From Swiss-Prot, chain A:
As a component of the IFT complex A (IFT-A), a complex required for retrograde ciliary transport and entry into cilia of G protein-coupled receptors (GPCRs), it is involved in ciliogenesis and ciliary protein trafficking. May promote CASP3 activation and TNF-stimulated apoptosis. Induction: By TNF. This is WD repeat-containing protein 35. It is found in: Cytoplasm, Cytoskeleton, Microtubule organizing center, Centrosome; Cytoplasm, Cytoskeleton, Cilium axoneme; Cytoplasm, Cytoskeleton, Cilium basal body. The gene is WDR35. Component of the IFT complex A (IFT-A) complex. IFT-A complex is divided into a core subcomplex composed of IFT122:IFT140:WDR19 which is associated with TULP3 and a peripheral subcomplex composed of IFT43:WDR35:TTC21B. Interacts directy with IFT122, ITF43 and TTC21B. Interacts with IFT43. Interacts with CFAP61. Coiled coil: none annotated.
Swiss-Prot record, chain B:
It is found in: Cell projection, Cilium; Cytoplasm, Cytoskeleton, Cilium basal body; Cell projection, Cilium, Photoreceptor outer segment; Cell projection, Cilium, Flagellum. The lineage of its organism: Eukaryota, Metazoa, Chordata, Craniata, Vertebrata. It is linked to Cranioectodermal dysplasia 4: A disorder primarily characterized by craniofacial, skeletal and ectodermal abnormalities. Clinical features include craniosynostosis, narrow rib cage, short limbs, brachydactyly, hypoplastic and widely spaced teeth, sparse hair, skin laxity and abnormal nails. Nephronophthisis leading to progressive renal failure, hepatic fibrosis, heart defects, and retinitis pigmentosa have also been described. It comes from Homo sapiens (Human). The gene is WDR19. As component of the IFT complex A (IFT-A), a complex required for retrograde ciliary transport and entry into cilia of G protein-coupled receptors (GPCRs), it is involved in cilia function and/or assembly. Essential for functional IFT-A assembly and ciliary entry of GPCRs. Associates with the BBSome complex to mediate ciliary transport. Induction: By androgenic hormones. Expression increased 3-fold in an androgen-stimulated androgen-sensitive prostate adenocarcinoma cell line compared with androgen-deprived cells. This is WD repeat-containing protein 19. Some isoforms are tissue-specific. Highly expressed in the prostate. Lower expression in the cerebellum, pituitary gland, fetal lung, and pancreas. In normal prostate, expressed in both basal and luminal epithelial cells. No expression detected in fibromuscular stromal cells, endothelial cells, or infiltrating lymphocytes. Uniformed expression in prostate adenocarcinoma cells. Component of the IFT complex A (IFT-A) complex. IFT-A complex is divided into a core subcomplex composed of IFT122:IFT140:WDR19 which is associated with TULP3 and a peripheral subcomplex composed of IFT43:WDR35:TTC21B. Interacts (via C-terminal region) with IFT122 (via C-terminal region). Interacts with BBS1. Interacts with TTC25.
Length: 118, 122
């Protein structure tokens, strides 16, 4: 059983078990998106991204990187899977941060996102 | 010795060992001969011996029904085998594969999907 086993792992907070279940499933499955949502809720960006890419849903795999503020992975996946819509995301996020006078945070994101010039 | 509670158990053990080793034809032959020896004396044959003989004979008939191209009969027999595939340890992977193919030919595609999903266990 897969659908209930993922729920048991989640309620037990055995996220290693969830990761093992997600990597033991076939390439596509009705359960992998749910596992990735669970990972996103708990905050495991890497496992959620791998699960979504297994589902073949790169759009969500980058939306979670944006949501979890892992901009390096977001830009890398945009370069790979050809979205290229995250440049504006970074630009306006850093603009908002500067509006809050948190220039250091803007520098930190620009370093994370490899926008080293900015 | 006419202690027929132990003759059936010995027959089951021998047939199961030969089945596990991978010689299903020899296991079926020996189990059938032993079953006929027990039957010839008008003795109540235990249900375990009959079940083992039925499973072995179903697997034996798989080859015959596939041989003549009758995909429905062979597919039904392969479903019966796959439901007990643990009784065929040394050929768990091959037989199951055949089942899917047969279940694809006979139109039992739901069974094919279920068996292939069971194949994709790690």
């Amino acid at each position: 059983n897969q659908e209930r086993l993922a729920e048991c792992y989640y309620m037990l907070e055995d996220y290693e078990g969830l990761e093992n279940l997600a990597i033991s499933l076939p390439e596509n499955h009705k359960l992998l998106p749910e596992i990735a949502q669970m990972f996103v809720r708990v905050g495991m960006c890497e496992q959620a991204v791998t699960a979504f890419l297994k589902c073949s849903q790169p759009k969500a795999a980058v939306d979670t990187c944006v949501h979890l503020n892992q901009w390096n992975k977001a830009v890398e996946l945009a370069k790979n899977h050809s979205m290229k819509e995250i440049g504006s995301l970074l630009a306006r996020y850093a603009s908002h941060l500067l509006e809050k006078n948190k220039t250091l945070d803007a520098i930190e994101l620009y370093r994370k996102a490899n926008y080293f010039f900015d | 010795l006419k202690q027929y509670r132990e003759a059936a158990q010995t027959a089951i053990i021998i047939a199961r060992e030969e089945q596990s080793a991978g010689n299903y034809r020899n296991a079926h032959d020996v189990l059938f001969s032993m079953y006929a020896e027990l039957k010839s004396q008008k003795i109540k044959i235990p249900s375990e011996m009959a079940t083992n003989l039925m499973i072995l004979h179903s697997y034996i008939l798989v080859k015959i029904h596939v041989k003549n191209g009758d995909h429905m009969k062979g597919a039904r027999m392969l479903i019966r085998v796959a439901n007990n595939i643990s009784k065929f340890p040394s050929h768990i992977v091959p037989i199951l594969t055949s089942t899917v193919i047969e279940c694809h030919r006979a139109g039992l595609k739901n069974s094919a999907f279920s068996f292939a999903a069971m194949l994709m266990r790690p």
